[PDB]
Each structure stands twice: as C-alpha cells, then as structure tokens.
Write a protein that binds this ligand. Structure first.
Ligand code: 42U
Lengths: 1340, 52
C-alpha cells in the first residue's frame, strides 16, 4: 500500500488476481528514440549504424577517402520550457568527427596526409522529452509508430478474381527494407514469370541467365533426372520405384524375368511395393516412350562436332535414332509429372527470348531503362546494383531473419544482399507451392506485420540526408587540391538539418500531440499506423487489412480504432503489449508446466503463439492453481474451443490484455455492444478537462496508471518529507537511505502553472500534498489537469435519471439542471495564443505604438504607453490587445469627401490601423505577454519593462534554489559533525559560513565532510553561471522571419461554462447535445427532495445496445449511497469505531473478491481522512471483463439503504405530483467533449472574397459562407425554386457585380436581383479560349 | 553573383560559428553597405507555386 492510497482507496470487485501489473504505458516511444540517438559500438540501429552504412566515402578511384570516426550530441541550446515559450525547436547540435585521408599516388596504400577535422557540425537533431514528445515549433509533437509488411519473402495466392477460370495463381514477393522489389508470379499457362518492382513482366528463367546459368544448369536445378540407356540394343531405363506413383502404365512394365505390371493397369502402391522389395533398378522400355520425354543436357556428335539436340528439347522417334548411331549410351531427361513434380521451368524456357547471360542482361537493362541503347557495362552495373550491392540493397536484420525462416533455413542472420542461392530457393518454394506441398501466407497475420517507431524512421530520413551528402562529398573529392580543404568545406548543414526538419515538421505520422487530456496524450503515444511511407493508402487497400485478425489478440486492441475513412488502418496498442526484439508484437503469457499454472511470465510473438494451446484469462483454478473443470475454453490455432484439462501450454496473464488503455477505462464493458464500445473509447479521448477534477465514481482501476504514467501529473523522484508546498513549487526533504552521499539534498519540483495546451485548453498543476507530510517514493506530488488524487478524472459524475422529460431529451438530447451550471463544475478554462506581427512594407515599417488613429480614450485605456495590454485585464470582443499601425500614405479621396474634410478640417492620417484585437465573441483574461525582437532593433518601453521584470524574477528564483539547497546541505553537515565531536548549542552559535573549517576525528566521516564541501562549492558557482546564462537568454533578440521587426504574443484565458449546443457523453458511446438548461425548480426529485442533475432518454438505451451505462448508473447510485451514509456518520461525528466498522463492511462485501483491507492503518488520523475523502461518494473499480456482477451491486445497494431496483419514486418539480412507474436514478460519470458550440457556430453576411475566382472566403477568421454543393442544388431543383437557386449560385456568391447591386437593394428595401453572369463560367470561357478552342455566345 | 558569394560565406561560417552566422554577420564579410543582405536575401527567393 502507498501514502496517497491511505488518502483514498477504490473499492475493487473482480476475482482474478493480477499475476502481472500494467507496465509503463509510454514504453515504446521512449525506447525507440533511446535506440536512435545513442552510442552503440556495433552495427545495431542508431546514428552509429546509419553512419557506418554510407561511410567511409571514397572518391572515384582517386584514392581520396573521407572516413567517419565518432560523433556527439551537444547540450540543448534552450531547454524544454524556454523552447516552448519562444517557439524554437528542442534539439541538440550534432558534432561528428571526420577524418580526411589522401593516398599517395601509385601506392602501396599509405597516406601523404590525413587531416582529422574536429567534429564538423551537420544538422540539429530534435530531442524527445521524458514524456515521449517532441517540440518542433514551440509545440509538443508525437511521432506515431508505424505498421508495415515486414521485410523478407512472402507467398500469396490471388485465387478467385483473376481470369475467372479458377485454377488460382501462385506468387512470391521479395520485399527488402531498401532497394527494388523482386516479384515472381505464375500465369494460366503455368509459365513462371518475374518482374522487378511493378514493372514489365519477363519470363522467370531470364533472371537465372543473368546469374550466369546456362539452360543446362537451370534444368539441372529445377528437375530430377530420368536416365535412359541403350545397352546391347533398343532402350532400357533406370527406374526409381516411387516414380510410377500417380501414373498409368503406357506399356508392359517388366524386368528381372518377372512381369510386375501390364499395359492398361494404373500403378498403385501394390505394384510400387513389389518393385521396391524385388529391387528393380533397370527395366526395358519401348523406343516410342521417349517421344514426349524432354532431354536435359546438350548433345553433340562426337565425330562431326555438330549439335544433335539442344538442352530442354522434346525428343522424337527419329532424333533418338540420330543420337544413337553417334555412339551415345546415356540420355538424360527431365522428371516431369502434372501432379507431383511439375514441368513449369521447361515451358518458362520455351517462352524465354534469350540464350546467354549477356542477352538476358540486355533484356533486363532494356526493361528497367527502356528505349535507350543498352551497353554491356550498363547492364552489368544495373543488374549488380539492384539486389547485389551493399549500397543500393538491404533487407537488414528483420528482413534476412524472416527470409531465412520462411525458407525453412537454419541461419537466423545473414548478409543484407541476395545471393544466387537465395533467389533460387525462393523460386523453388514457389514451384513447391504450385506442386502441392507448402501453403501460402496471409498479409494480415501480425507475424508478417512489423512495427517501426520514432527512432527507426528518424534514422531512415537521416540516412537520406547522409546519401545526399555522400553525392556531394564524392563530387568535391573529384578535382580537389590536397591540404587546403578539410571535412568542413564539403559537408553542409542545411541538407541534413532539413532532412530531419522536414520529417518532424510535416509528415502524416508526425503530428501535434493530442493534448486536451491525459488519456488523449497517452493513447496517442501508443498508436499504430499502416499509412504514410512504406505503408498502404486508404484508397488502395480494402477490407482485409483493416479487419480484426485473430493475431490481434493481446497485441492490438480490437475495439479502439477510428470510425472514419480509415478504419483498422490505425488501431491502438494493447495494454500489456510489447515491441518484439526483431520489431514484431509480443504479449505476456503464463507458462503452464505439467498440471500447474506457473506465475512465471512468458512473452510470445505472433508466430511463437501459433502452435501452443493457450488457456483463458477467465478460468477457474484454485489452491495449487489446477484447472477446476476437466475441459476449459481456450484458443490454439486461429480459433477457440473447449480444450482438455491437461493439454494447454499457457494461460492469459490478465483479463484486460485483449483491449487497450482506452477500452480498459470503460466500466461494465462486457455488457456493451462492440460498436458503442468503439464509439465510447473513441470519444473518451475528446473530453475537455473540467475546472475541478472530480474523480470517476464508477471506475476500472486503470485510471491510476493512466494518471501517473502520463506526464500530466508530478511524481516524486525520491521519498521523504515535504519541506514546502506552494501553488508554485513543492520542496521535499529526502530520506537518507535513498539519498546520495554528496550534495546533500532536497528534491525541488517546479510545477507547471496556467499555460496554453495544444488544443487551446488550459493545463495547470495543483499540489495534492500539504506542509510537512510523509511522501513515499513514486507518489503523486501534484495533480495535473483532469486528474484527482493520483487517478484519472476526465469529467464529472452526476445524478442522472432515465425518463422522457417533455421531449427536451428527444433524440440523444440532454436536459441538465441549473444546479450544474451554477456549481460551475462543467465549466472549462481555455487558453488562447494571439499574435501581433510588426512587418516591413515598401511604404514603411509598422509601429507597435499606442498612438492609434481613430480610437477613444476607452480604447487606449487598457493599453500602456507602449501599446500592449496590461497583464490581468479582462477583455472581450473588439478590445485592442496590441496597438499596431502601418503606413499607407495619400488616401486619394474623392470630391464629396474633400468637401467633408474642408468643412470639418480633419487631417486624414498617413497611417492605417492594423492593431490586433480580440476575435469577435470570445472573452477572457490575460495571463501573459511575450515580445520577440529582431536582434539589434531597439526594444520599446513595454518589452523593456517585461525584460527587467523577467530578470528580477529570474534572480529571485535562482536565489531561492541556492538558498533552500545550501540550507539543505548545511543541515546535513550539522548532523555529521554531531557524530564524533558533537557540540549541540556550541556549533549553531558561530556563523554557518565558517563551519567548513571544523574537522572530525580520523574516520570516513571526515571524507563525507569533504564531499559536502566539494559539492557545496560546486552548487555555489553553478548558481553564478546559471544566473549569467538566464540573463543572456532573456536579453538576446530572438531570430525572426524575413520582414518582421517584432512580434507581440498575448495569452488569453477564457472561461466558458456550459450552454445548449455543447456535446456531452458517457464512456459508453452515448452522445448527446445539451438542449435546455432547466431550473432546479422544474427538476424531477425524489421523496427526499433531492433534485436530479441530468435527465436522460431511456429510448436511447434499447436500440444501441449498451447496457453498461445502466449498470454504471446502478452501481454508481450504490456508490453514492456508501458516501451519503458516511457523510452522515461524519456529520453525526460518531467516533473512529463506528466509521471504521462501516467502511470495513463496505470494503468486504459478501464473498470472494481480491481487494483485501485495513486496521494495519492508523485507527484515528489516517482513517478519518479516508472517510473524509469517501464522503463525496465511494469510488468503485470494475475491471474490464473481470467486473462486478448484478448480485454484488444489489448487495451494495442494501448496504446503501437504497432499493434493489435501482429505481425510486420521482415527482415532477412542476406539478409536484408523482410520476407513474418507478424511474432509474443513479450516478453516471460524464464527459464534456470539446465540440463546444461557441466554437462550432458560424455566420456570414458579406465577407472577403477569393482573388483567383471571386468567391466568398474568410480572411479575418470571419468565416466564408457555407458550401452549396451538387446535392443541395438538386434538392433546390426538385422544388420549383429557380430564383432561390439562381441567387444561390449567382448573386449571393459568384457574381462580382450581382453581390453589391444586391446589397444596395437589400438595404434600400427592394428585394430583387439583377443577376449577370457568374465569374466561374466567365473564367472558364477564357480558359477554353486560351486554348485553340473558340467558344462564343450567340444570338440575342 | 552577390547572392552566390552570400551563399559561400554561409557555407564556411555555418559550422564554424556553431549554429549559423547572425543575419548581420556575413554583412561585414561582404564589401557593400551590409544591411543590403536582408534586402537581397528577400528578393532572391523564388515565388511559391500558387498551386502548392
Ligand atoms: F481471439 C479469438 C477468439 C475467438 C476466435 C474464433 N473462435 N471461433 C472462430 C474464430 C475465428 C476465426 C477466424 C477469424 N478471422 C479470419 C482469420 N482466418 C485465418 C487466416 N487469415 C484469414 C482467415 C476470426 C476473427 F477474429 F477474425 F473474427 C475468428 C478467434 C480468436
């Protein structure tokens, strides 16, 4: 048990003990990047490997070589927070040692001079936070793990759809990590074909010739030998007795003076056995049987030196005679069978256009680069460079592994390039598949599916950078003078830096972390994608790959995937899942040895798991843990059934391991249909944090893990006592056993305060601990947004009643009491970042000055002298945050305006008002302001006020650091001096600064005093340098874009509570949009007179089958019951005994549950606090499939004083009369998603317009109008409304004349239209006429 | 040609200065009034395809 658990304990139903507890949920993200940037003294993946690949770069024969020595990553320029404020990227400089050697010309190899250029800088590579996030521009970002076809070889079918003759087809595909694809495929004529990439089809054998195999060796490779002897005269044959299987006698089969088979009798196992036991090696055959036989090798006349027959040719009765008289004793033929061993390769040769290696290479080179004249060196170079070059081709480790394994080889590791043996063996396996032995794999199987992560992808993009730098290095080493240039002048920065910057900045897999929510973060960071580079597209791959595979078990969550255009192309990572050593997916299991279930954990990959019979997470074992029944539900290969008692090899670790963290947070999930569960876990991530993090009343027991693992909270590094608790920071005094000897210590935690999240919500940490409190190591020191006391609260639980209320709940609609909007619980704090840009126009520079043409004193009031709004001033729509004015001279007015000016004597300014003002309708308070200035431009008044302020605050903070730290150290010196020379009152008298002189008796304690001395001084100077650095960082001008002189960013905090039109939802996939906000007066209430917060619609429950939301209600009610009781017993102030008794009773609850409990806990001070927290309601945990049962819920309702039905009497708050029938009332945990209506709402009358084609377009974030499409037009066409349509597509939109001539009539009170011609068609006319086409408008 | 020289200076001073030279750095390295960098540095840029 822990210390914050003594504060609050969640009551846990469920039986199954957890043999393994949930690991770090962020494991994948951090591990990957941990592998990428790291020093590995070998070829294992990392910057080292990608370096060793392309390097060393040598010139072309010129013997000028550039070799790579070692690299390093410099300390980050700005740390995370600073990088977030300013908007730069959090990255490290990459400094790599390059050694330039020049070989003496006409060597034995030795170097004239080798200049070692010390660490030339190439690029700045981004860094991953402790939370697995990257900051690109002032913004946290996540790189999604990728799921693709693993490198290796693969065998597929494509039966059915091709050709509609059936017969299937069989294909092999060699997919390397890098390099061209190698494809083999059959056809309806059983001719084997090969194609490189997706390119032109070539007869298979044509590649073999390029490996230097004559026809004879191809035949010798793919077929066996049928021996023919002419001995004495007329035709014997060698007979392997198995050859006659699946065939019928063509003649009398007889040898050894005994006739085994007669013509017309199919040769069966009997005949074959007779031949085998009588051992017939040689039989006599007719000269006519070789009429169809295919000769193996070449045959020439020994005398005339002429070719009798070429290899692979069909013999004839005459050809036999022609080669027999030449003195040929033996003839080798192919062993061919249309059932067992197929004659494919032979016909493949029959379609082969080539003869010799060079010819094949010609056809290949003319295939890959067609139309241009082929050359010998060209064909050779290309073909050798395709699959055989260390440069252009790699399957790497996973590739070679899966390759060799799928080829049934021994070696698990080998070369990254193909060999003749490789290609040949692949062809062999394909031919074997067509022959009937062996099966085709499937793409969806997770054994053929591989997971990449941030590290690998970043490695690849950096690899591209390194190759594009390689070309440059070789390009320069060409003409180079000797000792002048060094490994700087060649190697650039921008190519590499942009190679990585392009990746992290914009990529389909790199995105802005979804942080509105601790669940959203952690569920984004565990994610898979089959999209992007190396993957498929939504438009390409169909249902199969998307569909849930049996191999998804324990690895990919079945129920959490997006609902949109890409379904199952994302999924999510399962709870207990892990990335395999080779990069596959493996899931925890429990080993069953003999008849016992062992608690030893075992990790099995998708293929590892295949043959084993695995037991169930939910099964009954007891005592020694032997299976209670004689047969139990299990799953062995791809399916599930009842399995014998001792058969099963393994068992599921937990009940949750099938799902993900999102699904594992849904209570009573087993009772919900999969569609609504999907929708539920999909929406649970959209929950905006509330103002008061509440807690789920109805839980799971995962929420704690999500809260802690996600970095939103603040977790103790080391256990100790709290010295100080501020809303700003938290200072903990470390225990000695956990404490390092030197630098004494205290752990100081600087809490994140109100700041802008990625979703424009607020992220703010609050302290959960008090002054002088015991804290265990690994305990929550502070709550993040939407986290309560170390658990995950994504929303708030409330009293809910299921019953139709005056149709205000009509579809999914939600009817909420005024009690809720008053309590401000569902209220949310949004943090927006607004910016003002001072640019340079040819008319002049723009001023941030507070002097603005045409504004009242009320407008210039909220701004200081410099033109920026004061921190803390509450603003609304139209208020000026930053005064900005840009020059535009000579307005060039008109006559009447000139008259007006003549009468009113006003000087029309040469300056225009560009000032940044709060967007219309939004309102809030200003929590911060930043000013970025071009380095060298004079900082205005405001920016200087701010700079001085920040300097002072910096000095104050650093000084605080050094002070608490120093006191912390001297407090330890005081304690060590007291051993061996203790003087109590004597020591604390003299000045503390003079303490270091005092020594001790001979012992190690003197050396400890030494340690504290050293570290003390270290801290003392480190303070100095830190203050210096901070000051310089504050004062330095931030680098800005072209033309921008300065930038002012204002940070607003808006508070929006709740209003009709907002979206709210439970965890069960039940949506709703709040309809009306109803007075507490009109609210349904019970006999006790307590109104219900929310009134739902029962009709929503039966159709969409989610019954969990009802269970969740019931138990929820019961939970609150346990609270209310306690809430009375505390308000009764009974005593420790009564409370303790009742709480214990609650935590026990009938029989058979795994929770355990108290009175190991302090009877007074600890218990009363527990009850104190419980009084809101009693938090309950419902494990995913292990969850609570009806009887348990009713039993807990009995303890609650509340009915079993879960329904009570309710009265209409209006008439006061009772509602007929009982209605269900309970507590349902509810989330406010951020769809909030003051975001969604838009309206436009006359806005800006697009330049290219004149059409309505928002330029101000004053929205463009709605898009009227084809279907809407049709809908207008069905109705007889012509004028509505015409005005829709002419005057209201596209007509440049029509819109204004309209507006004037609209204000004049005349409703008409003088339409003219739409500008789209007008432009199209020109576009058509811009060609050789004349398009005219006729007649009149 | 001016733009090209401006590129050369960048290439040398980039790893030499450890990050990149300040916008005014190559300015003194170049013979002319040296604020011109910005001006030049602007006009050098090719217009982005409107179809991007
Ligand atoms: F985890 C479980 C639980 C139950 C079953 C199960 N129990 N009984 C039958 C099935 C069953 C059979 C097939 C499929 N899908 C197609 C997979 N085949 C194998 C090769 N690739 C294509 C075809 C499924 C599932 F999960 F996909 F829907 C379940 C399976 C796994």
């Amino acid at each position: 048990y822990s210390y914050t658990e003594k504060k609050r304990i969640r009551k846990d139903f469920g039986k199954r003990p957890q043999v393994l507890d949930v690991p770090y949920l962020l494991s994948i993200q951090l591990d990957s990047f941990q592998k990428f940037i790291e020093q590995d003294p070998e070829g294992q993946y990392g910057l080292e490997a990608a370096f060793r690949s392309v390097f060393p770069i040598q010139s072309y024969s010129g013997n000028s070589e550039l070799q790579y020595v070692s690299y390093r990553l410099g300390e980050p320029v700005f740390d995370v927070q600073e990088c977030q404020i300013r908007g730069v990227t959090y990255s490290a400089p990459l400094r790599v040692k390059l050694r330039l050697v020049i070989y003496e010309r006409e060597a034995p190899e030795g170097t004239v001079k080798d200049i070692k250029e010390q660490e030339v800088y190439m690029g700045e590579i981004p860094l991953m936070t402790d939370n697995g996030t990257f900051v690109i521009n002032g913004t946290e970002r996540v790189i999604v793990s990728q799921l693709h076809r693993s490198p290796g070889v693969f065998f597929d079918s494509d039966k059915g759809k091709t050709h509609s003759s059936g017969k299937v087809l069989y294909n092999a595909r060699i997919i390397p990590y890098r390099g061209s694809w190698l494809d083999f495929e059959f056809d309806p004529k059983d001719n084997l074909f090969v194609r490189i990439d997706r390119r032109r089809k070539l007869p298979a054998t044509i590649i073999l010739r390029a490996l230097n195999y004559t026809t004879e060796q191809i035949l010798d490779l793919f077929f066996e030998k049928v021996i023919f002897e002419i001995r004495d005269n007329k035709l014997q044959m060698e007979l392997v007795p198995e050859r006659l299987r699946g065939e019928t006698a063509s003649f009398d089969i007889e040898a050894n003076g005994k006739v085994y088979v007669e013509k017309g009798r199919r040769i069966t196992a009997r005949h074959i056995r007779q031949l085998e036991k009588d051992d017939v090696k040689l039989i006599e055959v007719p000269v006519e049987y070789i009429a169809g036989k295919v000769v193996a090798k070449d045959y020439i006349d020994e005398s005339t030196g002429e070719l009798i027959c070429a290899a692979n040719m069909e013999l004839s009765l005459d050809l036999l005679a022609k080669l027999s008289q030449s003195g040929h004793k033996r003839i080798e033929t192919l062993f061919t069978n249309d059932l067992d061993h197929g004659p494919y390769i032979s016909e493949t040769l029959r379609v082969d256009p080539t003869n010799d290696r060079l010819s094949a290479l010609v056809e290949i080179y003319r295939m890959m680069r067609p139309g241009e004249p082929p050359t010998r060196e060209a064909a050779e170079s290309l073909f050798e460079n395709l699959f055989f070059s260390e440069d252009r081709y790699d399957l790497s480790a996973v590739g070679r592994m899966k390759f060799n394994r799928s080829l049934l080889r021994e070696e698990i590791e080998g070369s990254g390039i193909l060999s003749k043996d490789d290609i040949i063996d692949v062809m062999k396996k394909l031919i074997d598949i067509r022959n009937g032995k062996g099966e085709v794999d499937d793409i969806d199987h997770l054994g053929n599916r591989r997971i990449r992560s941030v590290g690998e992808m970043a490695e690849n993009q950096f690899r591209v950078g390194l190759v594009r730098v390689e070309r440059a290095v070789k390009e320069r080493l060409s003409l180079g003078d000797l000792d002048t240039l060094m490994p700087q002048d060649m190697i650039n920065a921008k190519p590499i830096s942009a190679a990585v910057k392009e990746f992290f900045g914009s990529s389909q897999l790199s995105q802005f972390m979804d942080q509105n929510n601790p669940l959203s973060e952690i569920t984004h960071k565990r994610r898979i994608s089959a999209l992007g580079p190396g993957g498929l597209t939504r438009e390409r791959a169909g249902f199969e790959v998307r569909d849930v595979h049996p191999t998804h078990y324990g690895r990919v969550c079945p129920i959490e995937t997006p609902e949109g255009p890409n379904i199952g192309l994302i999924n999510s990572l399962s709870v207990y899942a892990q990335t395999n050593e080779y990069g596959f997916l493996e899931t925890p299991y429990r080993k069953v040895t003999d008849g016992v279930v062992t608690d030893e954990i075992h990790y099995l990959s998708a293929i590892e798991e295949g043959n084993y019979v695995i037991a169930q997470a939910n099964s009954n074992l007891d005592e020694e843990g032997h299976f209670v029944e004689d047969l139990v539900t299990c799953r062995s290969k791809g399916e599930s059934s009842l399995f014998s008692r001792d058969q099963v090899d393994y068992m599921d670790v937990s009940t949750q391991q099938v799902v993900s963290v999102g699904a594992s947070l849904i209570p009573f999930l087993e009772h919900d249909d999969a569609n609504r569960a999907l929708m539920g876990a999909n929406m649970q991530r959209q929950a905006v944090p509330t103002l008061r993090a509440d807690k789920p009343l109805v839980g799971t027991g995962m929420e704690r893990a999500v809260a802690v693992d996600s970095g939103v909270t603040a977790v103790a590094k080391r256990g100790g006592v709290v010295q100080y608790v501020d809303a700003s920071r938290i200072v903990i005094k470390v225990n000695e056993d956990e404490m390092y000897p030197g630098e004494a210590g205290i752990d100081i935690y600087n809490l994140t305060k109100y700041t802008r999240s990625n979703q424009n919500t607020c992220i703010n940490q609050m302290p959960c601990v008090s002054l002088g409190e015991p804290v265990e190591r690994g305990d929550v020191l502070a709550d993040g947004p939407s986290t309560d006391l170390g658990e995950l609260a994504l929303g708030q639980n409330m009293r809910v009643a299921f019953m139709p209320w005056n149709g205000y709940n009509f579809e999914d609609s939600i009817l909420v009491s005024e009690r809720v909007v008053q309590e401000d619980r569902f209220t949310t704090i949004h943090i927006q970042e607004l910016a003002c840009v001072s640019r340079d126009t040819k008319l002049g520079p723009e001023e941030i000055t507070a002097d603005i043409p045409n504004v009242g004193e009320a407008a210039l009031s909220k701004l200081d002298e410099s033109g920026i709004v004061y921190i803390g001033a509450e603003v609304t729509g139209g208020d000026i945050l930053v005064g900005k004015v840009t020059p535009k001279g000579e307005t060039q007015l008109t006559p009447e305006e000139k008259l007006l000016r003549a009468i009113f004597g006003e000087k029309a300014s040469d300056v225009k008002d560009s000032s940044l003002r709060v967007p219309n309708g939004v309102s809030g308070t200003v929590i911060d302001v930043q000013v970025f200035t071009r380095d060298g431009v004079e900082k205005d008044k405001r920016a200087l006020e701010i700079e001085e302020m920040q300097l002072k605050q910096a000095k104050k903070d650093l000084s605080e650091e050094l002070q608490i730290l120093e006191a912390g150290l001297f407090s330890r010196i005081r304690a060590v001096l007291v051993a061996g020379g203790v003087e109590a009152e004597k020591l604390d008298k003299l000045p503390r600064d003079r303490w270091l002189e005092l020594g001790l008796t001979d012992e190690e304690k003197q050396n400890q005093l030494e340690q504290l001395a050293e570290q003390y001084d270290e801290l003392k100077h480190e303070f100095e340098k830190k203050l210096e650095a901070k000051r310089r960082k504050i004062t330095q001008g931030d680098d800005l874009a072209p033309g921008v002189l300065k930038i002012v960013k204002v940070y607003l905090a808006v508070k929006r509570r709740i209003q009709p039109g907002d979206k709210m939802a439970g965890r069960h996939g039940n949506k709703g949009v709040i309809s009306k906000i109803n007075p507490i007066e009109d609210m349904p209430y019970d006999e006790n007179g307590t109104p219900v917060d929310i009134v739902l619609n029962p009709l929503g429950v039966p159709s969409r089958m989610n019954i969990g939301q009802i269970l969740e209600t019931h138990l929820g009610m019961a939970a609150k019951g346990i609270g209310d009781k306690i809430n009375a017993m505390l308000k009764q102030q009974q005593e420790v005994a009564k409370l303790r008794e009742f709480i214990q009773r609650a935590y026990d609850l009938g029989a058979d549950v795994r929770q355990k409990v108290d009175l190991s806990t302090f009877s007074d001070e600890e218990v009363m606090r527990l009850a104190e927290n419980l009084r809101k309601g009693m938090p309950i945990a419902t494990p995913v499939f292990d969850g609570a049962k009806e009887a348990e819920i009713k039993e807990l309702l009995k303890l609650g004083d509340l009915p079993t039905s879960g329904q009570i009497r309710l009265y209409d708050g209006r008439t006061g009369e009772q509602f007929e029938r009982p209605v269900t009332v309970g507590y349902m945990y509810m989330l406010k998603l951020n769809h909030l209506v003051d975001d969604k709402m838009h309206a436009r009358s006359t806005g800006s317009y697009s330049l290219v084609t004149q059409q309505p377009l928002g330029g101000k974030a004053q929205f463009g109008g709605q898009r009227f499409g084809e279907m809407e037009v049709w809908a207008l066409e069905a109705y007889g409304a012509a004028y509505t349509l015409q005005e829709m597509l002419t005057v209201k939109s596209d007509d440049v004349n029509g819109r204004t001539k309209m507006y004037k009539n609209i204000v004049d009170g005349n409703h008409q239209m003088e339409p003219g011609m739409p500008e789209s068609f007008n432009v199209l006319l020109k576009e058509i006429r811009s060609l050789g086409i004349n398009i005219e408008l006729e007649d009149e | 040609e001016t733009i090209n020289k401006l590129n050369r200076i960048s290439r040398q001073m980039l790893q030499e200065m450890g990050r990149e030279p300040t916008p005014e750095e190559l300015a003194e390295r170049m013979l002319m009034p040296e604020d011109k960098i910005r001006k030049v540095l602007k006009i050098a840029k090719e217009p982005i395809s409107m179809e991007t």
